[PDB]
Design a protein around this ligand. Structure first.
Ligand code: ZN
Ligand code: ZN
Ligand code: ZN
Ligand code: ZN
Lengths: 240, 240, 240, 240
C-alpha cells in the first residue's frame, strides 16, 4: 500500500512576499505534495496556521513520513506538537527536514546541538556532490545536482556527525556543506536535505523532487510502535 | 597544565540509604574525585543541593571535563543550569556520564532521544568486553572488566548510534548493553560509561576508576570556545 | 523485477560429516535458496567444487546479491574469482556473509583486517539482541532471536567498525559478539550475519531465514555499474 | 618518551624532475621529518630505494607512527613489506597517508576498496574546511587551510566511510573532497590527509605541517601488541 506522507510547511513567506508567491503561489508544500502524489505516494499537507499546526494525533498516527520546511516562525510551533512529533519519530515515523528546517524545534531537539551554520543570500551557484553513490536516496540522480542560484549554508554545521553523508555541496563563494545527512533516532529515520530557499524555484527542479521522493521511501517505517523499556525479570537463572 | 575535572553527584541516596552510606560514607563523588586527584587531575566535586547545583558560570568556565551521576532527582536540576552545561559542552567542555546519568536532563538533551532502556537490580555479574582495543579510554585495560555484582541495563538503549562503542556488556540474566559509548556534540566529547549502581562498590574497582581517568584525559577540550556562525561575506567572487 | 540472488556455499561439510548431512542433505545453500525463492526472489545457488566456483562473469553480471558461507576451504577459492566478486561489490552488487564466512577471502579483502575472533564449539545458547530496531533488516523480528545451540564467536572481532550494528549476541559462556554488521564498499552493501554453524539446524530457524531475506532486499543495488574516476575537466573557470 | 615517527617517501620525483627538486632538494620526507623533530618527535626517514624500502622488522618495531607518501612507483613496494606494515598497523602502529599515498598498496589493503577518485593538475586553489572542530588533529588550526595551488582530487573517493571526516576541501574548479579522514584498523589509527603534490611547496605550509604533527600525536599506539584470538574456554558453565 502507498507510503503516507505529510508535507508540513510554515507557509508564511508565500502568503506575504511577492517574489516568493510568484514562484510558489499555492505554497512549497503544494508543489512537493503534488510531485509525491504523482509518484504514487499518499500525500497530504499541513501548515503552521491550521489547528495543531495540522499535526493532530489523528493525522500523525496515519503519517508514515513527515517532511518539514520552516524559516521565520520556528518559535511558533507549540511545544506540545513538537513533543508529539518527537514521540512519533522515535516510534518509527520518518522525518525529512528541508533547508531552513535545520533550525526547527523538532530538528534541534533530535540533534541535541544548535544546528547553527554560516550562511549568505547571494543568488550563488551550488553543486551537491554525491558521496554515497549506492545509497537509495541518490537513485536516478547523477554524480551531482546543480542549482544555479541558492542561499549558501557553510560549515561548520553544528550537527552530530551523520549516520551517513549523502551529499556535500560546493558553493561559488568558497564554502562547503554537508547537504544530505541521514540519522536514526529510536526507530525513526531522518534525512536532512539542504536545498530549498523560498526565493528560488528549487522545489521545481526534478532532481531535488526525486531526492525527496527517494528519501520518503528510504525513511518509511519498518516495525513502527513496539519497544519495551523498564524493569525486567531475568531470561536466565541468576546464581546467588 | 593539569586537566580540571568537576565530579557532579546528585548525593541524595548516600544520605537516605544506610546500605549506600556504608559503601560511600562521603558519597560517590568523593571516591571518584580522590582517585582523579591522585592520578594528577585538578579535581573538585559538586552536588544537586549546592546553589546552581554547584555549576555556576564561574565553575563551568574553569571546568575542562564534567563527570555526571544522578538517579532519583533528575527533575530537580533546573533547566537554566542544564542549558548552561549544554552550551559549555558544545563549546568544547568534556562530559562523562555515569550509570543512571543516562536519564539526566543534560544527557537526554544532548542525545535527542529518551535514553530509556531495560533494567534490573539483582546483584548479578557484568562483564564489560572491550570492542575498541586501541582506544585511549581503554589504555591499560585487559580484554574485559568483570564486576561481580551490578544493576543490569539492557538493549535496546534509546540513544543515537555512538561515534564509537568502546565496551559491550554481558549480563548474567541474558541481556547485553553498549556500556561505553563516545559521542561528539559541537566541540565537546562525551563518554557514557554504564557501571556505577549506588548499592555496589563499583567505584572502588580499580579498572572502573582507570577507565574514568582515561576518559577524562580523552575528553579534555581542544580549541575550546565560541564557534563563529551567521552571515558571512564570500571568499570568492560571485557572478552577479 | 524480482531481485536475483545467488547463494554460494563451500558445500564440503554436508558431504564429509554424517551429522551435518542429516541436517542439510542437499547443502545449506539449497535450504536458504528455497526459502528465498518462496519469498519471491529469483534464487540460484553456486558451490566451491564447480568451474569458477559457479561464479563466472555471466552469473555475477546478473547477480544482484551474493550470499556467502564457507569454513574449511577458504583457501581454495581462487584469487581470480575473489577479485571478480570484489569488483562486482564495488560496482553495487550486494554481499551477505554468513557465519564462518568471516574468514573468507572476499570478506577479508573488503574489510582490510584479519577478521579473526575468539570461538568455542560447545552447543551453547545464543541470544541475538536487536540494537537497530528501525532497520529494514529487522522487519518482522522481535527484540531478539534465540538459538538453543550455536557455536560461540566472541569479541574482539577484528573488523572495521560497522556502518551500523544491527544485532549483538549474548552467549551462555560469557562472551558477546557484534553479530549483524553492515558495511558499504563502493556502491555495494554488505551485511555480516553470524549464525550458521554446520552442525546445528540454524538455517531452519524462521527468524534466521527472515533476517537473510530482509538483508537480501536491503542489499540489492539501485544505481548499479561503473563510477567515473580519473582525470576530469573543470566545471568552473580556473584563474591562471 | 617522545613518539617515534618514520616518514616514508618514494623519493623518485625529487631526484628526476628539476622543477620538483627545486622545491624539495633533499626530498619531501626531509622537510616533514625536520618539522616533526622540531615539534619534539623522535623522527626518522625511509625511502623506496633502500633495502626492504627502509622498513625492516627492526625499524617497524620501534616505529610508533609511519607516515607514507608515494605516487609513480606504488607497484615497486614489495608485498612482503606491505604485509609487514599491515600487521604492524593492526597491532596498533599509527599510519598517516598523504596525498597520492591514496593509491599505495598499504592504504588500498587497509581500505578494501580501489581508493580511486577524480583528479586534475591545474594549479588551482584548495580550501580545506574543518568539519570536526574539536578533534585533536585540528588543534591550533583555524576554520580552514587555504593552499593557493594544488592538484584537485574530487569525489567520489572510493573509500570506506571514515570513522570521522576532519576536513572537506573546496576546489576552484568546482569539486569537493573528503580531505582528512580517520579510520581504525585493529588497534591502529590511520589518518589520510590529501594535500601534498610534488610540484607545489605544500609541505612548506605551516598549517599543513601542524596537521601532520597533530595527527602523529593522535595516531600514537595504545595497548600496542598481538591481539588474542582463537579457541577459548567458557567463563560460565554451559548446560547439557
Ligand atoms: Zn533560507
Ligand atoms: Zn542504577
Ligand atoms: Zn563455524
Ligand atoms: Zn599528486
Amino acid at each position: 500500500t502507498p507510503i503516507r506522507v505529510v508535507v508540513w510547511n510554515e507557509f508564511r513567506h508565500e502568503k506575504k512576499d511577492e517574489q516568493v508567491r510568484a514562484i510558489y503561489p499555492e505554497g512549497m508544500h503544494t508543489v512537493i505534495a503534488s510531485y509525491l502524489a504523482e509518484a504514487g505516494f499518499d500525500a497530504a499537507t499541513a501548515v503552521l496556521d491550521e489547528p495543531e499546526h495540522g499535526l493532530t494525533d489523528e493525522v500523525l498516527d496515519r503519517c508514515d513520513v513527515l517532511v518539514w520546511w520552516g524559516h521565520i516562525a520556528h518559535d511558533e510551533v507549540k511545544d506540545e506538537v513538537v513533543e508529539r512529533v518527537h514521540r512519533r519519530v522515535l516510534e518509527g515515523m520518518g522525518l525529512i527536514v528541508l533547508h531552513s528546517g535545520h533550525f526547527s524545534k523538532i530538528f534541534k531537539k533530535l540533534m541535541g546541538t544548535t544546528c547553527n551554520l554560516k550562511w549568505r543570500e547571494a543568488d550563488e551557484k551550488e553543486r551537491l556532490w554525491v558521496v554515497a553513490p549506492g545509497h537509495p536516496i541518490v537513485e536516478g540522480i547523477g554524480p551531482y545536482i546543480e542549482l544555479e542560484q541558492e542561499e549558501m549554508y557553510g560549515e561548520f554545521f553544528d550537527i552530530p556527525e551523520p549516520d551517513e553523508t549523502i551529499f556535500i555541496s560546493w558553493f561559488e563563494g568558497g564554502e562547503v556543506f554537508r547537504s544530505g545527512c541521514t540519522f536514526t533516532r529510536g526507530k525513526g529515520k531522518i534525512f536532512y536535505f539542504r536545498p530549498g530557499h523560498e526565493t528560488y524555484p528549487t522545489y521545481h527542479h526534478p532532481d531535488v523532487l526525486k531526492v525527496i521522493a527517494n528519501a520518503v521511501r528510504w525513511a518509511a517505517p519498518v516495525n513502527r510502535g513496539e519497544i519495551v523499556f523498564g524493569n525486567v525479570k531475568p531470561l536466565e537463572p541468576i546464581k546467588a
